[PDB]
Design a protein around this ligand. Sequence first.
Ligand code: CLA
Ligand code: CLA
Ligand SMILES: C/C(C=C=C1C(C)(C)C[C@H](O)C[C@@]1(C)O)=C/C=C/C(C)=C/C=C/C=C(C)/C=C/C=C(/C=C/[C@@]12O[C@]1(C)C[C@@H](O)CC2(C)C)CO
Ligand SMILES: CC(/C=C/C=C(C)/C=C/[C@@]12O[C@]1(C)C[C@@H](O)CC2(C)C)=C\C=C\C=C(C)\C=C\C=C(C)\C=C\[C@@]12O[C@]1(C)C[C@@H](O)CC2(C)C
Ligand SMILES: CC(/C=C/C=C(C)/C=C/[C@@]12O[C@]1(C)C[C@@H](O)CC2(C)C)=C\C=C\C=C(C)\C=C\C=C(C)\C=C\[C@@]12O[C@]1(C)C[C@@H](O)CC2(C)C
Lengths: 177, 75, 185, 162, 171
Amino acid sequence: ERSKSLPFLMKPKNLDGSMAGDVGFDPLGLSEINDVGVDLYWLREAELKHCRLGMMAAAGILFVEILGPAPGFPAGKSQMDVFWKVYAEKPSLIGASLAAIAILEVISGVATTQGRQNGDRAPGDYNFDPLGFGKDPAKFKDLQLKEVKNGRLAMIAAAGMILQGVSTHQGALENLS
Amino acid sequence: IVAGHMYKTNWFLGHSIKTILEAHKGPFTGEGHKGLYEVLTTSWHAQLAINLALFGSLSIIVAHHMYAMPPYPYI
Amino acid sequence: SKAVPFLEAPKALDGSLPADVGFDPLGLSDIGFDFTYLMVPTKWDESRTGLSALKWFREAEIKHGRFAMLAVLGWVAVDMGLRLPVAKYAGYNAVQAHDVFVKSGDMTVGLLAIGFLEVVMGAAIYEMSKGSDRAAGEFSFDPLGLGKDPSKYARYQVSEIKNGRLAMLAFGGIATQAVLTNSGF
Amino acid sequence: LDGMIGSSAPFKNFDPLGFAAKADQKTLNKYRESELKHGRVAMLAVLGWIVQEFWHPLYDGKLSSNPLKALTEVPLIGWAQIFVAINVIEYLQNKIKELPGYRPGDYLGTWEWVEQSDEGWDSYQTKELNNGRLAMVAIAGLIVQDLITGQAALEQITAGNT
Amino acid sequence: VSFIKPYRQDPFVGHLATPITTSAFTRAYLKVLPAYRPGLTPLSRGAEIGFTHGYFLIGPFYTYGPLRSVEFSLTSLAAGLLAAITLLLILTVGLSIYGQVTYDVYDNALIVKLVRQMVGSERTQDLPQIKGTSELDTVLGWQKFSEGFFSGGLIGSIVAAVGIALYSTYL
Ligand code: CLA
Ligand code: CLA
Ligand SMILES: C/C(C=C=C1C(C)(C)C[C@H](O)C[C@@]1(C)O)=C/C=C/C(C)=C/C=C/C=C(C)/C=C/C=C(/C=C/[C@@]12O[C@]1(C)C[C@@H](O)CC2(C)C)CO
Ligand SMILES: CC(/C=C/C=C(C)/C=C/[C@@]12O[C@]1(C)C[C@@H](O)CC2(C)C)=C\C=C\C=C(C)\C=C\C=C(C)\C=C\[C@@]12O[C@]1(C)C[C@@H](O)CC2(C)C
Ligand SMILES: CC(/C=C/C=C(C)/C=C/[C@@]12O[C@]1(C)C[C@@H](O)CC2(C)C)=C\C=C\C=C(C)\C=C\C=C(C)\C=C\[C@@]12O[C@]1(C)C[C@@H](O)CC2(C)C
């Protein structure tokens, strides 16, 4: 009856055990929202998209700062400020990436709403397993848990890197030391 | 934006225009505003009357404030 | 009552709460306002029966006591030295460290973190108002485990509330006096 | 000190000196008439005191903003007209007092419409009475302060003579 | 409570009992006016009405006439007085013709009872009908009312002229 994460709180009604990373940590009861097209399905899809985006962004920042930029690309070690140097010399790359992300996000929203309507697609599912790393069950649950935990950690990390780069105008590991 | 969070729509929060109107009675006005909510939610003509009157008054106020305080450069 | 004998009792200080002696001359434990509405302004839930002002006051008193105990520990620590093993914390007492650290962008971080914890535990308070069995000040935080043996739990309860009252008054004195036992006005 | 209107929460049926415990209905009606007249006159007097202090458009300015000083500056032929108007009003009130069903302070004749009074009507009458009492105390304080100090309300407050 | 009700418990009259039509202030104020004050003969009502009306009528004529004067002028006062008196004469002519064409009665509050009791099988409108029971609603009553209005108008206009002269001279 009590949430596993917060023993002083009752179990959130909509979070039983199903989703990976579920420990009952919903103090504000946001999982019970059923308005403005927002429900547990939409919240989970948003959480998974945030997890994946944060993982990609943190990996990119760390890669560029440690191993350096790719040939022909600007340096500076400040990832929040090197973006304007890339846009100053290769605006077409940024524009094409933005257009591609826009199209993919329109497709993602359509897929989310459709899967919410005629329930056949789990939240965050895009059938993207080209290498077959999660075919069999009893490993899919473990992979989902790993992805969720890594994505939450990378969300926090990427938000921290964004704020550090905006404020200190220095590199992430530069702030570290 | 602040004024937009006034009327109850889908949560237990905000006002009901029916309850506001029905509470505004008086010794001189009998039942007061009881039934006005039903009038303005079932008649397009009443809404058009109110909106058009206030809209024309707003247009005249705009006309006054325009020349009174010119809001555009070199106008 | 057991204190201020010429006043019988407020009305609600029956004894169901720990550390109860009956001291409430102003009868503050009888206000009909459910202070959970200071958090959730509307009834929101149809199951929100309501929270008595006495239980809200007990939660507030326990929280105040814990805050004051930690506060006097910190203020006494910075009077006798004991700076964090990092730069930018040199010596600037306690009457001036607050402002200089509010300037240096970390008191805001502390505000954010404390507010996060406060929001979670206030959600706990709101669930208590909704009708959860959780008692005031009970966050089920017993990691080391010195909370079993119900007699020990009750003794530690009364101990915590009495120590919190003492620490509230002691912090009031310390901040008002600008410390006399370990520093000067 | 009866089922009369005017009993509020802080002191219900406030007759500490027992003026009403021995009086008959006629004396109590007289007391209510006096209280209501004093309250209305005092509300007018307080509002006039303040407004005159910070606004005296008439008489082409002049008429020093301090009350109890403009009292001796009005042309004294405008005093006569105000006196005559008050007198005619009170003659009309006297004529009203003999109308059937008359109530002590009721010069609007609300007894014609208000049979079986509500709680809102009683509450509004009590509101008028309490505002009148507060204005009586306020105008007494205003006159006494202006007499002893010589400064008006917003002038004494502004300087800080408190 | 409600402060507007049907007049005299008749929901079909073209009237309402508002806090202005049937208020105690309205009752007393209209009952102290000369037109409705009890105990006044029609001549007395006319005299008082004429006095008040001439008194306030001389004002606009003297102040804003064709012969004004920012100072006090006897010619301006005489012009205003004559204009007020002639206006009172015109009003008295109107009153006289109105009373001539309106009523045919010499003693009211009786003829109505006589025709409600002893039958009124005549040309009607004199025996029967008869609107109003006041003494002002007779040929004799209205004639004396007009006479009083005219005399009181003259007297009040003269009194107001004297007062205006005194105010302009000694003040
Ligand atoms: C009410 C509690 C409280 C508060 C507000 C402070 C505030 C402060 N202390 Mg401090 N301190 C306290 C208690 C407290 N102390 C106690 C009890 C001790 C002894 C253990 C110390 C020991 C101490 C040292 C040794 C030093 C300070 C210093 C400082 C100052 C720098 C920190 C800063 O800028 O904000 C940072 C942000 C915060 C302090 C907010 C606290 C947020 C915490 C970390 C969140 C987690 C709390 C924790 C998990 C509670 C567990 C309960 C529950 C979860 C079960 C600042 C004025 C330094 C200084 O220079 O002072 C002059 C310094 O060197 N303190
Ligand atoms: C007891 C009430 C009372 C008395 C005795 C006075 C006396 C005075 N006022 Mg005054 N005044 C009052 C109330 C009063 N005021 C109120 C309530 C207001 C607010 C509107 C004002 C606003 C006011 C201004 C703005 C000025 C004066 C001025 C003056 C002085 C010159 C007379 C004049 O022009 O009056 C003018 C009065 C008015 C314009 C408003 C009077 C409205 C009356 C009080 C309400 C209706 C009365 C009605 C006939 C009787 C009630 C009916 C029913 C209840 C029975 C004189 C000392 C003048 C002066 O020289 O100032 C120093 C001046 O310029 N007064
Ligand atoms: C209606 C809708 C879409 C939809 C739908 C459909 C289509 C109807 C289908 C479904 O049926 C429903 C629904 C709702 O899904 C809405 C669209 C979504 C919006 C409104 C898009 C918002 C995206 C904004 C982002 C993601 C911007 C991020 C900015 C960054 C800045 C980066 C910086 O580097 C910059 C530039 C400067 C540097 O110095 C530092 C920083 C600041 C870090 C980080 O990235
Ligand atoms: C949109 C796009 C790029 C957009 C870039 C933009 C907007 C950038 C604009 C800017 O930089 C400028 C200009 C100047 C700056 O100052 C301003 C900005 C704004 C910064 C590229 C698309 C690029 C699109 C590409 C490359 C598409 C390739 C498609 C292929 C190969 C299709 C193959 C198939 O069609 C067949 C053959 C058979 C079918 O049956 C099956 C399939 C497989 C679908
Ligand atoms: C008055 C008070 C407590 C009074 C208690 C009383 C009377 C109790 C009386 C009783 O117990 C007895 C005696 C006996 C019992 O039988 C009866 C009662 C009746 C129960 C506490 C004040 C408490 C007052 C407090 C705590 C004030 C704290 C102020 C602080 C901390 C300021 C912090 C700063 O941040 C600023 C604002 C600015 C920065 O620049 C500088 C610093 C200094 C850092």
